[PDB]
Design a protein around this ligand. Structure first.
Ligand SMILES: Cc1cc2nc3c(=O)[nH]c(=O)nc-3n(C[C@H](O)[C@H](O)[C@H](O)COP(=O)(O)O)c2cc1C
Ligand SMILES: CC(C)=CCC/C(C)=C/CC/C(C)=C/Cc1c(O)c(Cl)c(C)c(C=O)c1O
Ligand SMILES: O=C(O)c1cc(=O)[nH]c(=O)[nH]1
Length: 366
């Protein structure tokens, strides 16, 4: 509706993408966000958008997904952009470079991205100090309805995956409102095998024990982030383990290793995870499945191809309590956040929902 949305989407972003390679663009976006060089978002969040979940108030249900701010450099700039919550990461225990460049690719004709970053990470110690420098500022933000998530990965050469995640819980758990056990990156060999029943149960038991050993004020919720490429068996098993262990929530979904028929981008056959519009409905359907398998009792953060209020509401009605976006930001720029929120509010009113909370899982009750 606004002129700024139009200017960014039709002119500024496509022009700048024509000038800058994907990883240079990503780095500049992080820099510009971190320095607060963006104008403050003018959208005032209505009470209809507030969600209480995971032991926290969320001023609005639209978050920035993991992978944008991998190293916790731009958290305050992201809240300024109008995100209701920020997830940083993935962070690995030791610093690591990730894959050789180029490792990110735009598919403009599909409104999609393919990436194979491979968990490039400053490491736990660097991120720990970065978050400690603003820990009390974050405590106030959280109290004000603006929570922080930290997404944990594992190093390429580690000989004990569970210990990598445990180290992440110990080091960054005390600084996070929620932690994410990311077992769904398509870009680390053997990682997605940790989604299997026996491996997942053993990994999450260890993670939860570590979390429970933190002091009360420093004890985060623990969520598991899952792939969009799971078999029905895999999903049944994850739901079973989640309920057996009392895992606090799920993030649904990561990027897809599938390549849906109809992709037009020249770079469609690059190796990596596919994000954006072609992922959207695969993610929505995964949310729908996981909500049903967990009887609506396990909070879900829905992610994959959200670019509009309709996209957000579809995931909410399928069972998401909160949503995230990333790829839409890369195409449309900062005004997409306000756009999604304004559209979501309008649609909630049009469909007779009192607020976001009333719409969570609504399709299952039709
Ligand atoms: C360039 C890029 C880097 C990403 N890095 C991470 C990561 O480090 N950890 C993670 O859990 N997900 C990562 N993701 C996945 C996103 O968090 C999200 O699950 C996925 O992109 C679907 O959302 P979208 O379609 O709105 O981008 C990344 C995605 C992209 C496009
Ligand atoms: C996305 C954002 C906060 C933009 C602010 C305006 C700026 C500084 C734009 C210039 C850089 C640019 C064209 C970024 C778009 C872009 C990209 O084109 C791609 Cl490919 C990626 C992977 C990312 C990751 O964040 C990305 O942001
Ligand atoms: O670092 C990456 O390559 C990465 C991690 C992840 O979880 N998802 C993704 O698409 N890329």
């Amino acid at each position: 509706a606004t002129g700024d949305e139009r200017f960014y989407a039709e002119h500024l972003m496509p022009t700048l993408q024509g000038l800058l390679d994907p990883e240079s663009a990503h780095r500049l976006a992080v820099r510009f966000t971190s320095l607060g060089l963006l104008p403050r978002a003018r959208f005032q969040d209505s009470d209809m958008l507030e969600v209480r979940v995971l032991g926290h108030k969320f001023r609005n249900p639209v978050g920035i997904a993991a992978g944008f701010d991998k190293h916790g450099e731009a958290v305050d700039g992201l809240y300024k952009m109008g995100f209701g919550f920020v997830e940083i990461g993935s962070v690995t225990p030791k610093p690591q470079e990730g894959n050789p460049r180029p490792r990110v690719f735009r598919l403009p004709e599909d409104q999609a991205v393919i990436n194979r970053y491979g968990f490039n990470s400053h490491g736990l110690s660097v991120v720990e100090h970065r978050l400690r420098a603003r820990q009390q500022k974050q405590a106030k933000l959280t109290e004000d309805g603006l929570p922080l998530g930290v997404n944990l990965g594992k190093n390429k050469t580690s000989v004990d995956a569970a210990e990598d995640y445990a180290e992440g819980v110990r080091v960054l758990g005390p600084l996070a409102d929620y932690l994410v056990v990311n077992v769904s990156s398509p870009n680390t060999a053997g990682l997605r095998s940790l989604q299997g029943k026996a491996e997942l149960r053993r990994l999450l038991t260890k993670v939860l024990q570590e979390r429970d050993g933190l002091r009360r004020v420093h004890r985060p919720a623990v969520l598991v982030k899952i792939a969009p490429d799971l078999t029905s068996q895999d999903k049944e098993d994850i739901a079973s383990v989640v309920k057996e262990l009392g895992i606090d929530g799920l993030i649904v979904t990561n990027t897809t290793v599938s390549r849906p028929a109809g992709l037009q981008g020249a770079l469609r056959s690059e190796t990596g995870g596919l994000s954006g519009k072609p992922l959207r409905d695969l993610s929505t359907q995964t949310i729908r499945e996981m909500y049903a398998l967990t009887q609506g009792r396990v909070p879900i953060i829905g992610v994959g191809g959200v670019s509009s209020g309709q996209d957000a509401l579809e995931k909410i009605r399928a069972g998401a309590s909160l949503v995230q976006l990333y790829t839409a930001l890369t195409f449309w720029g900062p005004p997409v956040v306000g756009k999604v929120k304004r559209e979501l509010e309008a649609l909630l009113k049009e469909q007779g929902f009192g607020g976001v909370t009333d719409a969570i899982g609504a399709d299952h009750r039709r």
